[PDB]
Amino acid sequence: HRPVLVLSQNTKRESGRKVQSGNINAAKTIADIIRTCLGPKSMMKMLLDPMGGIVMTNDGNAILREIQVQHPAAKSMIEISRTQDEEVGDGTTSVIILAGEMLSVAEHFLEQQMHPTVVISAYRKALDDMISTLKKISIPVDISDSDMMLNIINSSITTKAISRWSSLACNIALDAVKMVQFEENGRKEIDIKKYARVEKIPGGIIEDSCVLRGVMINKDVTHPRMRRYIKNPRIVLLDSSLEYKKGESQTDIEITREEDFTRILQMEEEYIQQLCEDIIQLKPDVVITEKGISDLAQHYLMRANITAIRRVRKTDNNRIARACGARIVSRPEELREDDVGTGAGLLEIKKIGDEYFTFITDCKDPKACTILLRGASKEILSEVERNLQDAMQVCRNVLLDPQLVPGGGASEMAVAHALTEKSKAMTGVEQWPYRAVAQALEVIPRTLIQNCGASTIRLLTSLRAKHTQENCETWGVNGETGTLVDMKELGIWEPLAVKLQTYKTAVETAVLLLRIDDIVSGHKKK
């Protein structure tokens, strides 16, 4: 069988209007997955995974991560959700919706004999005015006021399914972030990623949840003769083992005399004694390590009335050091008093459902914390854990950037009008696609009132009319009533950093996707 002379065997090409409109249609399709996960009246989405698990959430990023798409253009929108998850907290659903609209308005102009570079250029210019406008309508935050900070958090957990217990979640998030405000060298940091541990234990009710002034580990004591309750322990943290091991060499010890066998074994016992004498010179109460503890080592530790924990994970041991103030050492022979975790509080090993949990709490001034969650099952515990992650990120955000923007749709309307008033003096071909950006901005209050069952004509017509005046500029959507209320009374305020990034991502997303005129598929790499 003589083949046809070809190049690039088993490859495909698509080009032209089938791509220019194709890639936009792909973005329009994926955008609808989380359309109903924006406002305070959202519904829960039940997602099934191939492993046999169930995810119940209304978080836009968690939902999209579980969706596998085939279209190479839809994959780009998934990457957008990945970026937002790390840069901002609650800048999720509104970004995918707005980004889709930036492409929708592009399709209109692209089919009207306009070169893609004119559409792209017009959007790039509009960004400068949307960012400039947002900075002019912000309000400074006095982050030292407990009530202002709690209200900011309340506005970020309202959308999520734990808003029913806002009087608990708001206090959990605010204090948990404060406990991880670091300043040791010349740099201020808020670390809510390495030390902000959330520990969920099935059982009880959500109203039982609390924040621990310290840490907890799911470990028991090595030996029942050791104390399970120490009011004011001297805590020493080790990284080394208390065992004797053959070295990484070719050591060969000849047993030739009657006593040689037993003499070697005696020295092995003496090794353990040498370690035991060095780790008690500081008169510790508690020794926590990561590696094994020999039976002989326990003999001496019991005589010293020392409580020992055997095999603590590295991520837990570093967190213990921050809570109790101890130093972790890897050479027991160089232990010093400066290593002892003074200022630590109660050590108590408790039983929760016939399972042991060791609590190290009531510390003077810990730099790490654990949030203890209780609930009926993993269903509610998973919902709470994820929602607290967002609350601590939003608290952290305003603590580093103390500026709020009037939210609930008020921001998007004010910016859309600012764009319109400037567009009057463009006097060029870009005048029209410039104005198109202002129209795209209105999708946010539109979707907020659609998800509430309200008229899309009565509210948006009146709301747009109210933003013709220069007095208020804070008219938005009341997601509970279905009417229009001045945001100065609703109290819905959103971080400036989230609003600035929302516009930057939406415009730059379009810049990438509007430049693709040719899709090549079917090649392999070597």
Binding site: R2, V4, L5, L7, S8, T11, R13
Partner: protein, 535 residues
């Protein structure tokens, strides 16, 4: 490219283009010449008095061994569009002249073989084809220069018998070298029309019966049919035949249209029985009233007729075929009578002894007529010891009859044995240099091709072609060109005038003309579009 365009799309021009083949260049021309070599290598092996025979096995398993190129080439399974034309060349020669079934293939092949060098020299393919015409005219014009005959077709038939011997000498019937030569001459001259020089092929019938020997082949001045006397006790000998040729069955006449006779009464039933009896008597007496004593009927007989034929001493045969009663009526000078009631003595045939011949243990009962009155038709009766020699004998006598007809059409002859071909090659060479404008190479190639015949004859005769050709060509120049040819046994000298090797002028004129035209129509091709597999 096909099935792939620069834009990645399929590119389809003609149906199933991926199953086609095209190659033009000089490769189409070399492929045509090369394929012709395979054909020429076959026929060259059966040229000359030592020509070897071919065994042809038919698709049904039947086998016949022949020498006649018409029977060799017609049974080929060659699937090549140009090689098939080489067979048509031998057909055209067979239809017009009937002799050179081997020669035209060998000559045409030589023209294609010698042309091979001309293409490699860079000579335009068409200029080669035209160059052969300029040289061919020279050979043809000189071919008509040397010719003479003393044949008058009256009594001095010596050179006519010699022509038949020359033709038959190449066949497998040399055991009858003289006998069949004389039969062929007598067969044609007794039916040929001297006024127009026409010979009607239907006036010579060729029959045969397996058994005996070739030496028993006879020429019968009359007709041979399958005799089957309707009455087994009827005398089998008529000394003086008065022959009634009838095309009506010996049964009561019936209408051709729908009849459906209505019979009602017993008088009607019985009356018909009588009337029908009378019809049987009348139809026989109507023959006797004419003096006839032998009836030959296309149709059969009723049982009632056979008894009446006996009692009236009226022999007859049954179911004699269309062409048989046609030939009998002509050979005997009679006419075919439609009905019984139209019989008259004036339409009776006249013939002498009528007998049937029994052959060994079989029941063939073949007719022989001894005497006739100014018959214009003859029958040849071929015998032989096996089926193959008889069928080949039919072709051997056919060729002998054809060359006699050709001399009647045109009585100009030439000397054979290669003398005509060598002389033509020398004549073309002499004029090939008058003038060497462009065609010098082509005209010389033609002259060389003409020698393929005495060279192949020399090889089949057991001689070296260089030792033979160089001597004859020198002798034809050193002295006034004699009719000097070649032979295997040399017969003393190679003087064709003394060996009596006689060939027809119009035969060779057609061999040169037809071979040249066939070469032209297959040189001037540079594209073959043959389909491949079905799917």
């Amino acid at each position: 490219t096909l099935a792939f365009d620069e834009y990645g799309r399929p590119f389809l021009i003609i149906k199933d283009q991926d199953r086609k083949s095209r190659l033009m260049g000089l490769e189409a021309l070399k492929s045509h010449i090369m394929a012709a070599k395979a054909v020429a290598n076959t026929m060259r092996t059966s040229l000359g008095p030592n020509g070897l025979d071919k065994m042809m096995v038919d698709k049904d398993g039947d086998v016949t061994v022949t020498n006649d190129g018409a029977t060799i080439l017609s049974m080929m399974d060659v699937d090549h569009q140009i090689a098939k034309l080489m067979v048509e060349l031998s057909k055209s020669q067979d239809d017009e002249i009937g002799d050179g079934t081997t020669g035209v293939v060998v000559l045409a092949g030589a023209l294609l073989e010698e042309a091979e060098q001309l293409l490699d020299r860079g000579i335009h393919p068409i200029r080669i084809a035209d160059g052969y015409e300029q040289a061919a005219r020279v050979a043809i014009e000189h071919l008509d220069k040397i010719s003479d005959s003393v044949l008058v077709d009256i009594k001095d038939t010596e050179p006519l018998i010699q022509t038949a011997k020359t033709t038959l000498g190449s066949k497998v019937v040399n055991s009858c070298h003289r006998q069949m030569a004389e039969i062929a001459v007598n067969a044609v001259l007794t039916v040929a029309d001297m006024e127009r020089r026409d010979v009607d092929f239907e006036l010579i019938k060729v029959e045969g019966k397996v058994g005996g020997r070739l030496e028993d082949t006879k020429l019968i001045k009359g007709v041979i049919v399958d005799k089957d006397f309707s009455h087994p006790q009827m005398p089998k000998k008529v000394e003086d035949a008065k022959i009634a040729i009838l095309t009506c069955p010996f049964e009561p006449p019936k209408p051709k249209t729908k009849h459906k006779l209505d019979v009602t009464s017993v008088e009607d039933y019985k009356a018909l029985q009588k009337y029908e009896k009378e019809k049987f008597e009348e139809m026989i007496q109507q023959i006797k009233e004419t003096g006839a004593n032998l009836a030959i009927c296309q149709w059969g007989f009723d049982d009632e007729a056979n008894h009446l034929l006996l009692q009236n001493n009226l022999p007859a045969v049954r179911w004699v075929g269309g062409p048989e009663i046609e030939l009998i009526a002509i050979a005997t000078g009679g006419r075919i009578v439609p009905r019984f009631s139209e019989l008259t003595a004036e339409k009776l045939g006249f013939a002498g002894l009528v007998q049937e011949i029994s052959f060994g243990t079989t029941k063939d009962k073949m007719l022989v007529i001894e005497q006739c009155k100014n018959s214009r038709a003859v029958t040849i009766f071929i015998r032989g010891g096996n089926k193959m020699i008889i069928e080949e004998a039919k072709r051997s006598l056919h060729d002998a009859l054809c060359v006699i007809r050709n001399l009647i059409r045109d009585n100009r002859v030439v000397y054979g044995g290669g003398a005509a071909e060598i002389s033509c090659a020398l004549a073309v060479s002499q004029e090939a240099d008058k003038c060497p404008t462009l065609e010098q190479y082509a005209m010389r190639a033609f002259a060389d091709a003409l020698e393929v015949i005495p060279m192949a004859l020399s090889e089949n005769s057991g001689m070296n072609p260089i030792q033979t050709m160089t001597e004859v060509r020198a002798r034809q120049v050193k002295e006034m060109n004699p009719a000097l040819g070649i032979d295997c046994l040399h017969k003393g000298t190679n003087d064709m005038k003394q060996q009596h090797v006689i060939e027809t002028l119009i035969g060779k004129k057609q061999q040169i003309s037809l071979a040249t035209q066939m070469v032209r129509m297959i040189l001037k091709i540079d594209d073959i579009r043959k389909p491949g597999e079905s799917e």
